Design a protein around this ligand. Structure first.
Ligand SMILES: CCCCCCCCCCCCCCCC(=O)O
Length: 248
């Protein structure tokens, strides 16, 4: 990917040709992208207790009430803001939670990322090469009334769910919907962004899972993801291709 790509993606968000995306927006998005990596470097060494105390989550009671009901919960969020910081907040305010991560190449790099996230207090299951299938483990967490977190706006594989996203076709992962259907767990959209020199985080009302249609649910997730991103366009650092048309 790159920043030329990032321009093509922001173009969808604001409904303008790539050339007309406001310069101020591109700068802030690039600044935001840099900030994530800058924070990732030092995050493991910060005072996690302090961060948990000083950062807030809007409408966190949504999550708490699902957990009071014994239902478990799926936190689905886009690549906006600093999701790693949100994870630290949850470890401190709730406890360890489970997630999954793509097994990058090289293997030395995958382990590095695992060590990183493990040092933040997450359980990260490999999508491949683990003892068991990841989405069985996730389901057990949900059935024990625990939260899992999933990055949920990108999955450009055969198995990704085809959805409309800012008026154009993309594919998103099916996991959040599958798990909610399977476990009865609440499916909460989440958004993270940068609010000045700090971090914004919000939980939104759980999604309607009545249809039992993985497609309708995932599309409803996208509709929300799209709305929030339209609200915080600069905080969504997507440098890789997102929409199908931008692919090989
Ligand atoms: C109520 C707000 C709390 C939300 C907590 C979200 C924590 C997410 C942790 C993500 C860990 C790994 C995902 C990154 C992998 C990737 O998509 O490149």
């Amino acid at each position: 990917g790159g920043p030329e790509q990032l321009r093509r993606n922001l173009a969808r968000v604001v409904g303008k040709p790539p050339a007309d995306v406001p310069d101020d927006l591109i700068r802030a998005s690039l600044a935001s992208y840099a900030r994530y990596w800058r924070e990732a470097f030092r995050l493991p060494a910060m005072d996690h207790g302090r961060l948990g105390e000083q950062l807030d989550v809007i409408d966190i009671d949504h999550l708490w009430s699902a957990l009071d009901a014994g239902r478990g919960a799926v936190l689905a969020l886009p690549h906006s803001g600093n999701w790693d910081m949100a994870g630290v907040w949850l470890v401190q305010n709730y406890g360890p939670f489970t997630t999954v991560a793509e097994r990058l190449k090289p293997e030395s790099l995958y382990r590095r990322f695992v060590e990183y996230r493990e040092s933040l207090g997450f359980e990260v299951l490999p999508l491949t090469g683990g003892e068991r299938p990841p989405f069985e483990v996730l389901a057990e967490r949900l059935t024990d009334n625990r939260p899992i977190c999933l990055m949920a706006e990108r999955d450009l594989t055969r198995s990704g769910v085809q959805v409309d996203f800012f008026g154009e076709a993309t594919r998103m992962p099916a996991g959040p919907a599958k798990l909610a259907i399977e476990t009865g767990a609440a499916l909460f959209p989440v958004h993270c962004w940068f609010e000045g020199d700090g971090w914004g985080m919000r939980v939104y009302p759980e999604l309607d899972t009545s249809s039992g249609d993985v497609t309708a649910i995932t599309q409803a997730l996208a509709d929300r993801f799209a709305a929030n991103i339209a609200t915080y366009p600069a905080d969504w650092h997507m440098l890789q291709p997102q929409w199908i048309a931008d692919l090989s």
